[model samples]
Target: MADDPSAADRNVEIWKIKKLIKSLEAARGNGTSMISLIIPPKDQISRVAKMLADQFGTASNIKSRVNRLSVLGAITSVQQRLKLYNKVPPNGLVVYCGTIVTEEGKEKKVNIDFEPFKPINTSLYLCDNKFHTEALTALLSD
Candidate 1:
C-alpha cells in the first residue's frame, strides 16, 4: 500500500526537506557575506522578522540587512515555516532553504528553520518567472 492513494504521501515532503538540508549545507560552505539577509513580501515581514529575532537575537544589523534586501527587491515574500503542511505521525516536517545572489557575485543562503506550531507556506519569491535571470543578463549588456 506504499504507492496506494490511501497511503500517506510522504515522499514529496521528504524530498523537499532533503533538498532544504542540501541547500543549507551549501550556504554554510559558501559563506562569503558576513550578513545574510532575506526579505519576504511586505505582508510577511513582521512574522519573519519576529522569527529571526527570536532565533538570532534582535540586533540592528539584522534589521538593516532585511531592509536593504527589501530595497533592492531581492527577496519576494517571506515563506511560512515548512512544518505547517506535512504533519504525519512519528516524523514531522522541516523548513525550506534557498539562496540569494548579490551583484558582486556573492551568494547568501537563507535557512528557514522548522517550526511545529507556526504557520508555514512557500515563499512568494522575487522572480515571478525564470526568464527574469535572462532578462537581467540582457540588461547587463546594456
Candidate 2:
C-alpha cells in the first residue's frame, strides 16, 4: 500500500490480519477475553512476560471464582505461547487473549498471536472488555 520495498509482504500480512481481526470481532464477548499487548520492534522479551507474571499475581487475588478463571487462564496460555521466542521478531509481537461467550452460552478461550511484516512504533498493554484492536487496525491506515 506504500512505496515500501516490502509492500507485498507488508500489505499481504495487513490484508490477512484485517480479515483475521474481523473473524475475531465476530466472536462476541465484551466479556473480557482480557489483554491486548503490543511489543513494537524493540525491548526485552520477558518485559511483557514479566507484565504477565505481575498480572498473574494480581489475578490470583481477584475475589470470587469469577474473573480469575478467564483472565488468569488467558494470561497463562498467552505466556505459554510467548516462550516461542528466542528474542523478538524482526518486526514485533502482538498478543490478545481471553475467554469469550458465544451464542451457545458457552465460555470459549480466544488466544491470538499476530506477527508483523513491518515495524510498529506503538507499544501498549490493555486489559479491557473487548479485544482492543485499535493498534493493528491502525496499521491498515497510515
Candidate 3:
C-alpha cells in the first residue's frame, strides 16, 4: 500500500520542527533549555510588535508564534518581570541567545539558520509552522 498523504504531511511537519530546533541548538548551544530577555524601553513595544507582525504576518494564531518562539528558546515569561529587549534596536527586535554543551566539551551556537530555499512564509498562516516543522524533520532525518 501507498503512504497516507496526511500522515506524510504530519511527518513533514514534525521534521520541520525538529530541524528548526536543531538549527537553533547548533547556533546557540545544545544545552539551552530556556532563554531570557531584558526589558526594552517602553516606547519600543509598539514598534517591536509591528515588526513581529510583519515578520509573522502569516501566523494565523499569534499563540502559535509564541509557541514556536518558546520551543526554540527564543522568549521567556517571568510573571510581572517579563519585558522585551531590543537586540536590533531600529526594529526593537528582541531575542534570548542560548548556549549548549556538546559531549566533546565543545559549545554549540544558536542563530537563525536561513535556508534560502526553505522560506518561513508567515503570510500563509499554517505554512510557516508547517515549513519549519518539515525542515526540522528533514535535517534530523539526515
Instruction: Report residue 41 deviation for candidate 1 (angstroms).
Output: 27
Report how far residue 25 has shifted in candidate 3, in Å: 8.7
lDDT by residue (tens digit), candidate 2, 32-62: 5476677777866678777788887766676
Give TM-scores for every candidate, taking all chains together and pairing residue i with residue i: 0.31, 0.79, 0.27
| Candidate 2 TM-score, true structure as reference | 0.79
Model 3 quality (TM-score): 0.27
Local lDDT at 63 for model 1: 52
Clashes of each: 7, 1, 22
The reply for model 2, stretches above 4 Å from the true place, is 1-12
Query: Clashing residue pairs in candidate 2, if any?
Result: 33-98
Question: Who wins the lDDT comparison?
Answer: 2
Measured with C-alpha atoms, the lDDT of residue 60 in candidate 3 is 34
Candidate 2, which ten residues in sequence have the lowest lDDT sum? 24-33
Tens digits of per-residue lDDT, candidate 3, 1-142, equal: 3787888887877677555566543443333223423222233344434543454333334455544443343322221112333232322222333445566766432433221223221121111111123333343566
Candidate 3: stretches off by over 4 Å: 1-4, 19-96, 113-142
User: Model-by-model lDDT, in order?
Assistant: 0.35, 0.69, 0.36
